Enzyme design. Structure first.
Site, PDB file in Angstrom:
ATOM      1  N   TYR A  64      -5.054   5.088 -10.170  1.00  0.00           N
ATOM      2  CA  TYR A  64      -4.746   4.311  -8.974  1.00  0.00           C
ATOM      3  C   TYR A  64      -3.691   3.233  -9.307  1.00  0.00           C
ATOM      4  O   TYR A  64      -2.748   2.995  -8.536  1.00  0.00           O
ATOM      5  CB  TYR A  64      -6.040   3.686  -8.463  1.00  0.00           C
ATOM      6  CG  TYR A  64      -5.985   2.976  -7.134  1.00  0.00           C
ATOM      7  CD1 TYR A  64      -5.920   3.690  -5.943  1.00  0.00           C
ATOM      8  CD2 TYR A  64      -6.082   1.591  -7.063  1.00  0.00           C
ATOM      9  CE1 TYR A  64      -5.906   3.042  -4.712  1.00  0.00           C
ATOM     10  CE2 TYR A  64      -6.069   0.930  -5.838  1.00  0.00           C
ATOM     11  CZ  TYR A  64      -5.986   1.660  -4.668  1.00  0.00           C
ATOM     12  OH  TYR A  64      -5.980   1.007  -3.453  1.00  0.00           O
ATOM     13  N   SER A  82      -1.424  -2.301  -4.253  1.00  0.00           N
ATOM     14  CA  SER A  82      -2.710  -2.923  -4.598  1.00  0.00           C
ATOM     15  C   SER A  82      -2.556  -3.809  -5.819  1.00  0.00           C
ATOM     16  O   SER A  82      -1.703  -3.550  -6.678  1.00  0.00           O
ATOM     17  CB  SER A  82      -3.790  -1.854  -4.861  1.00  0.00           C
ATOM     18  OG  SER A  82      -4.941  -2.423  -5.482  1.00  0.00           O
ATOM     19  N   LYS A  85      -0.037   3.078  -7.570  1.00  0.00           N
ATOM     20  CA  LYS A  85       0.309   1.897  -6.777  1.00  0.00           C
ATOM     21  C   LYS A  85       1.469   1.098  -7.387  1.00  0.00           C
ATOM     22  O   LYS A  85       2.271   0.519  -6.654  1.00  0.00           O
ATOM     23  CB  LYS A  85      -0.919   1.011  -6.557  1.00  0.00           C
ATOM     24  CG  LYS A  85      -2.023   1.685  -5.741  1.00  0.00           C
ATOM     25  CD  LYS A  85      -1.517   2.065  -4.347  1.00  0.00           C
ATOM     26  CE  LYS A  85      -2.671   2.287  -3.374  1.00  0.00           C
ATOM     27  NZ  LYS A  85      -2.158   2.365  -1.963  1.00  0.00           N
TER      28      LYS A  85
END
Lengths: 234, 234
Positions: free
Chosen positions: B154, B141, B158
């Site tokens: 996150y 991402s 990622k």
């Protein structure tokens, strides 16, 4: 639709440019095969395109010269009446260590590989902005991304192309025109730097250029550098 | 040939995962639609694949769990006898600012988004090495690449997936197995960071994954992060 679209490919007579021309025509695009001197190679690319059921013409132009870039575009419009994708592939090397590099050898590599990209990109940009569509793919190189002894001019030019690509991507984005770079590695002392343990083939770079140039998925891809290099950079 | 090849897609019941399953199956691949708790939606993805002339099955597994991952692989092998591509798409967010981020919410995101990728990739690695072919695409991402407030967990997971992608790419390369990542941006406050001035569609991420997963050109592409983000990162 792809079968009505037109691609202009600079230095398309052999290697990556030739494969790119063939790949683009295979999707149904009409292709202008640009060359500087090697008309015979270009004619054979055109012939192959026509043999495989497509349209193409070979147009001579040295893309380091503004006058000739104008004429390349002009002729492309006369024959095909539009331009949907530009692939800036024309380039040269003049390798030598920095301390031996003549100014003319620096300047000739800057003139074609970097300034040539400016000239062709500026020329097609206006067309693409008007019709509100277009895709531009600039051929850079791993040398531009990681550096490589003996190529201070070439790496400077190819990295310049990447910076140019990001800016122009931002300028044309509002009209939906994408602008990307493709970085080939070593394409058919070296293999220790290539995880995949082989040279790449020109078709593999071409196929990637063709993805960016023609795939519906790549309509949302701009300002990127796609490496086709067996894993040499990352 | 693609028509005898098998793809496993994790987190495939909706969004990017569903579009990816559909895209791979349209190239003729047999597709395993993995889901955790969305069986109805997963069944619907499978049905659409079949209705369009393809082959697919839905298989339940929470890929954060090492045992369920092996069961996922086993069921896949019992049904289709091979795995040629893996798409690690399964993921979750637990957003909050660092100063309020509970360990449990940090951990849950690391468990699925990063450790889940480790588990699935390792599980299929041995299969792919033995048969001397395979492609792995990890969905990362832009948050992992640029950072994003509220997503320390996150973005860490990622980014980790990217570092993981590069190492595994190097390890599996000698057998011709490719390992890449695809970085989606904002996929259907925000638009100022996207030159193409719109959200992406799932199908545009899926097409890029499908290119990496199935295109002959992408055989020479490994250890890369392909952004599908409207120009958000470069």
């Amino acid at each position: 639709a792809l079968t009505a679209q037109v691609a202009l490919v600079t230095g398309a007579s052999r290697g990556i440019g030739k494969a790119t021309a063939l790949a683009l025509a295979a999707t149904g695009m009409k292709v202008v095969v640009n060359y500087a001197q090697s008309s015979t190679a270009a004619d054979a690319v055109v012939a192959e395109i026509i043999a495989n059921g497509g349209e193409a013409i070979a147009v001579q132009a040295n893309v380091a010269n503004a006058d000739e870039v104008d004429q390349l575009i002009k002729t492309t419009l006369d024959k095909f009446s539009r331009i949907d994708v530009l692939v800036n592939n024309a380039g040269i090397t003049r390798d030598t260590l920095l301390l031996r590099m003549k100014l003319e050898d620096w300047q000739a590599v800057i003139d074609l590989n970097l300034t040539g990209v400016f000239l062709c990109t500026k020329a097609v940009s206006k067309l693409m902005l008007k019709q509100k569509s277009g895709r531009i793919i600039n051929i850079t190189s791993v040398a531009g991304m990681m550096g490589n002894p003996g190529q201070a001019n070439y790496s400077a030019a190819k990295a310049g192309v990447i910076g140019f690509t990001k800016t122009v991507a931002k300028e044309l984005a509002s009209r939906g025109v994408t602008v990307n770079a493709v970085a080939p590695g070593f394409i058919a002392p070296i293999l220790q730097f290539i995880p995949l343990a082989r040279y790449g083939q020109p078709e593999e770079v071409a196929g990637t250029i063709r993805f960016l140039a023609t795939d519906p998925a790549a309509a949302y891809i701009t300002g990127q550098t796609f490496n086709v290099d067996g894993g040499m950079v990352m």
